[PDB]
């Protein structure tokens, strides 16, 4: 059965994400509402539904932390200078991120974000980062709970898309790599568990107008790991 058949959408469905554990599907579009559906085979019903006024949404993501796997945030954002974060509690407590901590000129719209995990690498403490794709070549990485700007990674060209790769190192330590593509086809990989420094820079063979990069086969941002040893 069509998942949003129970409660129709009033716009084109711009983003779509499953929950990492629960049977929930979050849809959202330019009608500035976001809907969660308990999906099954027969009767995909609507769990809850939140209409953010004056804020059409373009990307919406279930985030679930690695430490306790008990937060269940929803980060959502559109063509705005803010990004909402709903804390799932089954009223609804949402917060708004609207401060680039000195970096507002290079981030004029919170549309293209991605959420990922990051490790402190002196403690074994992970925390979520949101990653915002900005104007020049910039990716502004900031904390997913405090909203503090952690670091920024600039590629040379027109930034078009990016993805997050993880690689394990030892027992309980992994490393986060940001993979960002020019429009022209040249790809930067930034190690960002340290300071956001480039470790590899390669070039796509062929390809001249590049719109979308993705990784897969392990833990992406859309197949997320529930436990840190499962990365």
């Amino acid at each position: 059965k069509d998942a949003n058949a129970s409660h129709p959408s009033h716009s084109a469905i711009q983003s779509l994400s499953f929950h990492p554990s629960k049977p929930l599907l979050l849809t959202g579009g330019y009608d500035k509402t976001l809907r969660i559906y308990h999906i099954d085979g027969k009767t995909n019903h609507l769990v809850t539904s939140l209409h953010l006024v004056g804020s059409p949404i373009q990307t919406c993501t279930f985030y679930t932390s690695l430490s306790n796997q008990n937060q269940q945030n929803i980060f959502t954002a559109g063509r705005r200078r803010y990004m909402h974060s709903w804390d799932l509690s089954l009223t609804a407590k949402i917060e708004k991120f609207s401060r680039l901590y000195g970096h507002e000129s290079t981030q004029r719209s919170f549309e293209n974000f991605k959420v990922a995990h990051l490790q402190n690498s002196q403690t074994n403490s992970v925390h979520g980062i949101v990653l915002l794709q900005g104007n020049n070549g910039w990716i502004n990485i900031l904390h997913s709970t405090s909203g503090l700007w952690l670091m920024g990674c600039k590629i040379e060209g027109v930034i078009t898309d990016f993805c997050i790769d993880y690689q394990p190192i030892s027992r309980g330590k992994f490393r986060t790599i940001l993979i960002a593509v020019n429009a022209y086809g040249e790809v930067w990989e930034f190690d960002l568990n340290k300071n956001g420094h480039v470790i590899r820079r390669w070039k796509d063979q062929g390809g001249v107008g590049i719109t979308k990069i993705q990784v897969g086969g392990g833990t992406t941002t859309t197949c997320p790991a529930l436990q840190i040893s499962k990365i």
Partner: protein, 329 residues
């Protein structure tokens, strides 16, 4: 249609066990019917096509027996979260109904076979099958103490069965469709109700004669009877509840419902009741508030009016009033 595939109360109506699908796999959860005395962990069926066909509360480590569709009765403790023991028949046939009396579990098969298991010994005691009963989908033990004589089996047509002779001793005219509820009321009566009809009938288990017919005003999903036959509450297809008060007295051959309860929200949206529970003066109704999470309500059903409309508070357009901010933002 309802996401809750199977659901049943424990005796005394204190917990509700319910099987719902969760993104192509069945999951079995238990909720307390009153919090004043969430439970966020489920039993997960790990196969995409294994599913629960029946479930029964045992009575004292508390457990559920879940009759599956691969010839197995799983026995699952609820305080812990594992199937403690896996009864199996020799076959792969789905099992249509189970019951237990004391420690003696009985079950029916899709090949119309009867199996008996012992919960104290974890063993298949008996396996048999009887003639002219060929589409069985309900059994009910007629209670006679620790003796577990006289099963009562339905196939659209109820048949009383002596198990020492493995033979049929009475034959009741059932329905025109498969029987969906078949429950013993007193030591001389049993109620039965079929799939897709709104007529229960109470039969006399000693003669075969139908005492009375009970008429819901919508197709009956589940029923509960209070433990002393004085009240029967059925829940129907349109999400309503109908209480027949004292149905076993002299509205002479067929009785209508005495009380009818439905739930609406503050808006006008009618939520459906599934699977209520009744006892002496106390009635506990269940619905789903969000998509699959059950909410309950206790009611003194003897002092409510006849046409009762429960009102619940449910989010429809409410402005998200954050506690850290006044109304002016």
């Amino acid at each position: 249609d309802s996401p809750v595939l199977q659901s049943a109360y424990d005796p005394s109506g204190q917990y509700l066990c319910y099987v719902t699908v969760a993104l192509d796999k069945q999951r079995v959860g238990v909720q307390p019917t009153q919090r004043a005395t969430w439970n966020e962990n489920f039993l997960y069926l790990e196969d995409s096509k294994l599913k629960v066909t029946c479930l029964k509360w045992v009575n004292d480590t508390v457990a559920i027996i879940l009759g599956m569709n691969n010839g197995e009765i799983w026995l699952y403790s609820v305080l812990a979260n594992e199937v403690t023991y896996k009864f199996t028949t020799g076959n792969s046939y789905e099992i249509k109904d189970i019951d237990l009396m004391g420690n003696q579990l009985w079950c029916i098969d899709s090949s119309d076979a009867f199996y008996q298991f012992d919960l104290l010994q974890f063993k298949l005691l008996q396996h048999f099958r009887i003639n002219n009963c060929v589409q069985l989908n309900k059994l009910t033990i007629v209670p006679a103490g620790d003796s577990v004589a006289q099963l009562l089996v339905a196939s659209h047509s109820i048949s009383l069965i002596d198990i020492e002779e493995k033979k049929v001793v009475m034959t009741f005219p059932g329905h025109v469709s498969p029987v969906s509820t078949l429950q013993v009321i007193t030591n001389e009566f049993f109620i039965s109700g079929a799939e897709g009809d709104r007529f229960l009938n109470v039969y006399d288990i000693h003669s075969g004669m139908t005492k009375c017919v009970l008429v819901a005003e919508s197709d009956i999903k589940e029923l509960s009877h209070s433990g002393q036959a004085d009240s029967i509450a059925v829940t129907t297809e349109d999400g309503s509840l109908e209480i027949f008060v004292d149905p076993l007295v002299s509205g002479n051959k067929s009785k209508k419902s005495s009380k009818k309860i439905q739930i609406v929200s503050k808006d006008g949206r009618k939520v459906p009741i599934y699977n209520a529970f009744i006892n002496k003066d106390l009635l506990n109704v269940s619905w789903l508030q969000n998509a699959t999470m059950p909410y309950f309500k206790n009611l003194q059903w003897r002092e409510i009016p006849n046409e009762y409309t429960v009102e619940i508070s449910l989010n429809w357009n409410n402005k998200n009033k954050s506690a850290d901010r006044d109304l002016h933002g």
